């Protein structure tokens, strides 16, 4: 999963944006006796631990603590128009303030694919850290990324 010195991406729940991030340390908090400060479950499973990741773009932050749910391995496979499938989750750049400009790596699923005599249009659903934008059109189709998972 996420080991020290591993290359994984971290997402900011407040903005729902994904950016390159590196793993610096992995740790977990346990209860003093029988009154845990506030954890979903006692430490024991790899998912029951806390991971420390830093943002390469903004390393000044220092050390950030994030759960595995918000941390995912960096994509390693690029999907081309010919390799685009429906129902697959991919990462693309979406800018809610100015969709016609550059956006941050926002997760989204392929909704529908459309081709024209000399133009291509792709439809995908975009989800923000809290707001939803399903049924949205993707201006950039060449920028498509696949998400990798541990498989369990």
């Amino acid at each position: 999963l996420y080991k020290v010195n591993e290359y994984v991406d971290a997402r900011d729940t407040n903005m729902g944006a994904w950016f390159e991030a590196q793993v610096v340390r992995v740790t977990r908090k346990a209860p003093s006796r029988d009154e845990p400060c506030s954890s979903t479950s006692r430490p024991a499973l790899e998912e029951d631990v806390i991971y420390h990741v830093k943002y390469d773009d903004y390393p000044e932050n220092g050390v950030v603590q994030m759960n595995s749910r918000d941390v995912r391995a960096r994509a390693r496979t690029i999907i081309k128009w010919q390799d685009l499938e429906v129902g697959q989750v991919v990462m693309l750049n979406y800018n809610p303030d100015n969709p016609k400009e550059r956006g941050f790596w926002y997760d989204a699923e392929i909704s529908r694919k459309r081709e024209t005599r000399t133009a291509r249009e792709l439809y995908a659903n975009v989800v923000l850290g809290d707001d939803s934008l399903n049924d949205c059109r993707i201006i950039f189709v060449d920028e498509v990324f696949k998400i990798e998972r541990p498989g369990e």
Binding site: D56, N93, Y94, E101, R102, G103
Partner: peptide, 16 residues
């Protein structure tokens, strides 16, 4: 890894 690290292209927001 190497002399420097490579980053992926990504930009958004409304810079001033």
């Amino acid at each position: 890894t190497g002399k420097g690290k490579w980053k992926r292209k990504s930009a958004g927001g409304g810079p001033s």
